[PDB]
């Protein structure tokens, strides 16, 4: 139905599939007899790898930011002594 | 060259232009700023990063499940579990 098609698209968009990938998934959807699991899995797996890569990138930043946070007292203490500034002057490892 | 190095490091952590601007002001006039200010800027960015990680991990878990159930071979997509899952959500 029209509602089911939108539901299909909605679910794919919720997983972050690109316009290109959703178009391909839709093509498979209405013409499955001429497509395979290798094609559908490839679409999913490529998106999966991009998501995991982005998570790892963010986690690296998360760890550095966490280290920056943890070393600072976070009070009225004069910034002339702030470890955050010292760290950023040296690098981005936190 | 140091100001540019500082900015580079801040950029590597994803700080916004606004946050970098605030950090630079603290850096140049530290005697009139506090650790509370610098830590707040760090926490705002850290929380933004953690929020995005959480959103992505949610997608990752679902995608991983879709991946694992499919044979990924010449098997006709008429039987594909990925398409079935997408229909259901
Ligand atoms: Mg110290
Ligand atoms: Zn302090
Ligand atoms: Zn500090
Ligand atoms: Zn299969
Ligand atoms: Zn399949």
């Amino acid at each position: 139905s029209d509602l089911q098609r939108l539901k299909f698209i909605r679910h794919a968009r919720q997983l972050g599939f690109s316009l290109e990938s959703i178009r391909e998934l839709l093509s498979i959807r209405i013409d499955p007899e001429h497509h395979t699991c290798q094609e559908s899995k490839g679409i999913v797996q490529e998106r999966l790898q991009e998501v995991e890569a982005r998570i790892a990138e963010l986690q690296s930043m998360q760890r550095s930011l966490q280290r920056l946070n943890d070393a600072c007292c976070g009070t009225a203490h004069s910034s002339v002594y702030c470890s955050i500034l010292e760290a950023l002057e040296q690098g981005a490892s936190g």
Side-chain angles (χ1 to χ4, degrees), chain A residues 72-74 81-84:
Chain A
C72 183
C73 76
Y81 307 110
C82 194
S83 57
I84 294 177

Side-chain angles (χ1 to χ4, degrees), chain A residues 15-18 42-52:
Chain A
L15 295 182
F17 285 108
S18 67
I43 293 169
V44 169
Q45 213 176 73
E46 187 176 80
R47 170 64 186 162
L48 173 62
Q49 301 169 323
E50 168 171 335
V51 168
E52 298 182 333

Side-chain angles (χ1 to χ4, degrees), chain A residues 27-91:
Chain A
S27 294
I28 294 176
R29 181 175 191 266
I30 75 292
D31 186 32
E33 306 69 38
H34 299 79
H35 290 283
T36 70
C37 284
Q38 183 169 180
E39 302 175 79
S40 57
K41 186 164 183 169
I43 293 169
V44 169
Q45 213 176 73
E46 187 176 80
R47 170 64 186 162
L48 173 62
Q49 301 169 323
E50 168 171 335
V51 168
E52 298 182 333
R54 183 49 173 166
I55 287 170
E57 285 174 32
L58 287 168
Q59 290 180 319
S60 176
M61 293 184 270
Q62 191 287 328
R63 288 189 294 273
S64 295
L65 290 165
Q66 181 70 69
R67 289 191 285 276
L68 286 175
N69 178 83
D70 295 357
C72 183
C73 76
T75 68
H77 194 201
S78 178
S79 64
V80 299
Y81 307 110
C82 194
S83 57
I84 294 177
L85 294 175
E86 293 169 344
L88 287 172
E89 213 64 290
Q90 270 55 66

